[PDB]
Amino acid sequence: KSKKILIVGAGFSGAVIGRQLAEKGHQVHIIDQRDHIGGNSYDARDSETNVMVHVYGPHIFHTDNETVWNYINKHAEMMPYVNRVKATVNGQVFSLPINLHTINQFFSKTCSPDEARALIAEKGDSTIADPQTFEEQALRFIGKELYEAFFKGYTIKQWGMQPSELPASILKRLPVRFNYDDNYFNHKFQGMPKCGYTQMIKSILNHENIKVDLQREFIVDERTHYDHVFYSGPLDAFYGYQYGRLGYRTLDFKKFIYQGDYQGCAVMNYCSVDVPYTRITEHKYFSPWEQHDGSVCYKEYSRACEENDIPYYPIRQMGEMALLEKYLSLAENETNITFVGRLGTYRYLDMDVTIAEALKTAEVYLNSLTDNQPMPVFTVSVG
Amino acid sequence: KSKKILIVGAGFSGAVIGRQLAEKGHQVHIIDQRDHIGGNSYDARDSETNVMVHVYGPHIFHTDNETVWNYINKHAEMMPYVNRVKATVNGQVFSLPINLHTINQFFSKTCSPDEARALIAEKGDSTIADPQTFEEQALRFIGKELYEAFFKGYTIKQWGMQPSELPASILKRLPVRFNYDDNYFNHKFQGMPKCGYTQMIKSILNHENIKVDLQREFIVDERTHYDHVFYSGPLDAFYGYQYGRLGYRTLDFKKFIYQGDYQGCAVMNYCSVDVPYTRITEHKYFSPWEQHDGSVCYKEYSRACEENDIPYYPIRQMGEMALLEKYLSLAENETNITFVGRLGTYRYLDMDVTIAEALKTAEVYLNSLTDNQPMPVFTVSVG
Numbered sequence: 001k002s003k004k005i006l007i008v009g010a011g012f013s014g015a016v017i018g019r020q021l022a023e024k025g026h027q028v029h030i031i032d033q034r035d036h037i038g039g040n041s042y043d044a045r046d047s048e049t050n051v052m053v054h055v056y057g058p059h060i061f062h063t064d065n066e067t068v069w070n071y072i073n074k075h076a077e078m079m080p081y082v083n084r085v086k087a088t089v090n091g092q093v094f095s096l097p098i099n100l101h102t103i104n105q106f107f108s109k110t111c112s113p114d115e116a117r118a119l120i121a122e123k124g125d126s127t128i129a130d131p132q133t134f135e136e137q138a139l140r141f142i143g144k145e146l147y148e149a150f151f152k153g154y155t156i157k158q159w160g161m162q163p164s165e166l167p168a169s170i171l172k173r174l175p176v177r178f179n180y181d182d183n184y185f186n187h188k189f190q191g192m193p194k195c196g197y198t199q200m201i202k203s204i205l206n207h208e209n210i211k212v213d214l215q216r217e218f219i220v221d222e223r224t225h226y227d228h229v230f231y232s233g234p235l236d237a238f239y240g241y242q243y244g245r246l247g248y249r250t251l252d253f254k255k256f257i258y259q260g261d262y263q264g265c266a267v268m269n270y271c272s273v274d275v276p277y278t279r280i281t282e283h284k285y286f287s288p289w290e291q292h293d294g295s296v297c298y299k300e301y302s303r304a305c306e307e308n309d310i311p312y313y314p315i316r317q318m319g320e321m322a323l324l325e326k327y328l329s330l331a332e333n334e335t336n337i338t339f340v341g342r343l344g345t346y347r348y349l350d351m352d353v354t355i356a357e358a359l360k361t362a363e364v365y366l367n368s369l370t371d372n373q374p375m376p377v378f379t380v381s382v383g
Numbered sequence: 384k385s386k387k388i389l390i391v392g393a394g395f396s397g398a399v400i401g402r403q404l405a406e407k408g409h410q411v412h413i414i415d416q417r418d419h420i421g422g423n424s425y426d427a428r429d430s431e432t433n434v435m436v437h438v439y440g441p442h443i444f445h446t447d448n449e450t451v452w453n454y455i456n457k458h459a460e461m462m463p464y465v466n467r468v469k470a471t472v473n474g475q476v477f478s479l480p481i482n483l484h485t486i487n488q489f490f491s492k493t494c495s496p497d498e499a500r501a502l503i504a505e506k507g508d509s510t511i512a513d514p515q516t517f518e519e520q521a522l523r524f525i526g527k528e529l530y531e532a533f534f535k536g537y538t539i540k541q542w543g544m545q546p547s548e549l550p551a552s553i554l555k556r557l558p559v560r561f562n563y564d565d566n567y568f569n570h571k572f573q574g575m576p577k578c579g580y581t582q583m584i585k586s587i588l589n590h591e592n593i594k595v596d597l598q599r600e601f602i603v604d605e606r607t608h609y610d611h612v613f614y615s616g617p618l619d620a621f622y623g624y625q626y627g628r629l630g631y632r633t634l635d636f637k638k639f640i641y642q643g644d645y646q647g648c649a650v651m652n653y654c655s656v657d658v659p660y661t662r663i664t665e666h667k668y669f670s671p672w673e674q675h676d677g678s679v680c681y682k683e684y685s686r687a688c689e690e691n692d693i694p695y696y697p698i699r700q701m702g703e704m705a706l707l708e709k710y711l712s713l714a715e716n717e718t719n720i721t722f723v724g725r726l727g728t729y730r731y732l733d734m735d736v737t738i739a740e741a742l743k744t745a746e747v748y749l750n751s752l753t754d755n756q757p758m759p760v761f762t763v764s765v766g
């Protein structure tokens with residue numbers, strides 16, 4: 001028996017769930033308030049340069065979950081690509097994340113791995129036993145100079161607060177790699193969709209039982225035309241923000257076009273507070289199998305997220321976490337609806353994780369129909 | 384009709400020719416003077432640490448030839464591997480090949496790509512119309528400072544000649560990059576066999592029609608027994624070294640074991656002429672997908688190849704080329720033999736070129752059989 005399903009959101013959560021159920025004969029109506037599919041994964045070609053631009057910022061696919069990998073490889077050709085971030089600070093260019101080259105270069109040393117462990121352990125401020133603040137967990141770990149060169153200015157720009165004002169919980173691990181691997185990611189699978197995420201998600205969306213409507217807001221009154229609703233909009237918004245708006249950072253992108261090769265890599269972080277942007281991305285560097293004479297770039301600014309802005313990074317400190325609980329209690333008393341996604345559950349989720357969660361959510365729903373059981377409102381842990 | 388074929392050597396040359404013909408029902412006899420297959424591509428595991436060691440030097444597969452790439456993929460699982468060489472000189476660690484990071488670290492700048500073109504154009508001497516020596520190539524494009532830091536000392540050790548005495552082509556090959564790409568090789572296909580080259584070659588050898596006798600020197604009187612001989616041993620040796628030995632450089636690999644990560648990367652170049660070894664290689668890093676606690680490393684020394692040393696790099700100057708001619712003129716007066724490979728033809732050949740050439744030579748013999756025409760001594764250019 002074919003169910004009627006409303007899915008709010010045409011990003012990965014909406015699409016993957018939609019496709020899983022379309023394949024099992026359900027009638028899937030997917031809507032999105034924006035004027036294009038893809039959610040925050042959307043890319044598109046700038047007309048003047050033909051560069052495939054990541055519209056909502058750099059989106060690097062990476063995963064250790066082969067099921068997910070095989071799954072996207074059904075909808076795109078993945079090109080190999082490894083993210084290699086550079087950072088400009090103190091009149092030098094370094095590689096990130098902090099590795100043996102960063103350390104040698106920064107200190108003008110010629111350390112082996114072990115020698116560099118020793119060198120970092122001397123630099124570490126153990127003149128403080130129970131580090132409380134982010135400022136003091138870094139200072140314990142990597143010492144004043146590195147903390148001040150690579151962390152303090154960046155954190156302030158990205159989070160809008162002094163690392164003294166932030167908790168030690170943020171930095172669980174000593175942020176140094178004691179080898180020369182400068183790949184940003186450790187995952188088994190990494191790459192970039194040859195024709196981009198918009199095409200990949202378009203492919204996922206291509207089934208007879210899926211209808212997409214764009215420029216289309218969710219309205220609660222619609223709920224009753226459907227057997228089930230998957231909502232990948234913001235949890236707070238669903239409830240009229242009745243208890244207040246969940247905290248995010250937002251990003252502004254200042255686009256410019258450079259005629260040539262503007263910086264020579266995909267992402268150049270700027271660690272200094274006195275540089276008002278957080279980083280510059282040169283988008284053509286994400287498609288290295290293509291060549292373009294004209295380059296699209298983005299200066300990236302981080303701000304507090306306000307009512308008219310797109311939300312990016314969830315803040316998830318004590319106030320925001322207490323606020324989320326109140327919305328959770330509302331959600332748990334709900335009936336033909338499941339909340340999913342970065343926005344529906346107030347978490348930061350990579351693409352690969354989002355896809356894994358969407359496949360599972362579909363699976364649970366499908367099993368709910370056959371076993372005659374209630375569909376849960378959340379398919380992952382949310383507390 | 385099933386021809387009886389003798390092949391001298393079980394490296395790539397021998398293996399691939401053997402396998403192409405076995406598959407055409409020929410009875411192929413492959414001898415090698417060593418007690419194992421693989422030629423200088425041979426890798427094996429160290430007892431103590433279990434690190435897979437590249438016995439005759441680290442061997443990285445790289446090709447723009449899709450056919451060859453497909454070919455070896457029939458016989459091994461190729462893991463992607465990108466070679467990122469570091470270099471120690473002047474109390475610092477740098478990345479090679481020369482790129483934007485190298486230029487910015489060496490001269491203490493934060494240039495954009497265009498600013499780096501300008502900086503290096505002012506350092507080079509565009510008054511040199513046509514660089515003929517290694518030194519001239521370097522002075523023309525990279526300038527005195529980069530030349531002397533990274534190339535002069537290293538080149539003096541590798542070749543045992545002043546760079547004014549060496550051909551420009553040696554340097555001509557290497558990327559001077561004005562972006563942050565530090566991939567040592569341009570080639571589209573680049574990787575390492577998951578199970579190593581010995582297994583890969585084993586598999587090429589593993590046909591019903593192929594018998595392999597190890598610890599077995601070639602003897603001239605065997606020729607009579609076969610319809611054709613493929614010889615991948617040294618050409619001068621085939622002729623009793625009757626005119627002198629072809630000029631080579633040899634390498635001494637000095638092994639040591641470290642409990643930990645010794646340098647943190649596969650290859651560390653030592654560019655100073657006052658450091659005696661040319662490089663240190665840490666072999667576990669060639670298998671990034673494996674984990675090992677102990678590490679096998681090699682300090683690597685270059686010196687003139689003598690009588691009992693293994694030949695690695697052919698010198699190929701006017702003298703060695705005169706000498707080669709003498710051996711060429713004897714080889715041309717042979718009837719049922721084709722000399723192949725780096726040793727058989729006195730050329731430096733990368734694995735992929737070796738294999739393409741083997742593929743071709745096997746093709747040329749099969750073509751010649753059908754058209755009852757004589758099989759030549761060389762299927763490739765050498766005079």
Ligand SMILES: Cc1cc2nc3c(=O)[nH]c(=O)nc-3n(C[C@H](O)[C@H](O)[C@H](O)COP(=O)(O)OP(=O)(O)OC[C@H]3O[C@@H](n4cnc5c(N)ncnc54)[C@H](O)[C@@H]3O)c2cc1C
Nearest residue numbers: 009011012013032033039040059060218233341349350351
């Ligand atoms: C700055 C940034 C960088 C990132 N970089 C990476 C990366 O490099 N690699 C990686 O793997 N992941 C990255 N991510 C995460 C990635 O963006 C997410 O995993 C992905 O967006 C999740 O897709 P989703 O569909 O669940 O949510 P979304 O993409 O956010 O889609 C939600 C959709 O629902 C729509 N919607 C919301 N409310 C309504 C409504 N009420 N009515 C109708 N439609 C509505 C929105 O228009 C939106 O399209 C990054 C995230 C951010 C913020």
Ligand SMILES: Cc1cc2nc3c(=O)[nH]c(=O)nc-3n(C[C@H](O)[C@H](O)[C@H](O)COP(=O)(O)OP(=O)(O)OC[C@H]3O[C@@H](n4cnc5c(N)ncnc54)[C@H](O)[C@@H]3O)c2cc1C
Nearest residue numbers: 392394395396416422423440442443601616724732733734
């Ligand atoms: C230091 C070094 C590093 C290299 N690194 C790379 C690299 O990174 N990537 C790459 O693509 N290529 C590399 N190469 C080249 C690579 O080693 C060759 O492509 C490959 O070895 C060619 O194989 P072959 O079968 O033609 O010759 P070989 O591998 O030399 O095989 C010849 C075989 O013939 C046997 N033999 C010789 N004479 C006799 C005889 N009289 N009787 C019986 N047996 C005999 C030998 O025992 C040997 O096993 C490197 C080469 C060197 C020297």
Ligand SMILES: O=c1ccn([C@@H]2O[C@H](COP(=O)(O)OP(=O)(O)O[C@H]3O[C@H](CO)[C@@H](O)[C@H](O)[C@H]3O)[C@@H](O)[C@H]2O)c(=O)[nH]1
Nearest residue numbers: 441442443468470533534535537538541553554650652654
């Ligand atoms: O730091 C360097 C590196 C290279 N060169 C010069 O450039 C030439 C060519 O260099 P390269 O591309 O490294 O070829 P080789 O050094 O001859 O080959 C070795 O080094 C390569 C880089 O890791 C490996 O792929 C090969 O297997 C190994 O034989 C050298 O002979 C040198 O004269 C330098 O002067 N300094």
Ligand SMILES: O=c1ccn([C@@H]2O[C@H](COP(=O)(O)O)[C@@H](O)[C@H]2O)c(=O)[nH]1
Nearest residue numbers: 098150151152154155158170171172175
């Ligand atoms: O090189 C670095 C690494 C991390 N961080 C800060 O640490 C936070 C989380 O650390 P991690 O555990 O995600 O690396 C990031 O948001 C950022 O504020 C930096 O400023 N510089």
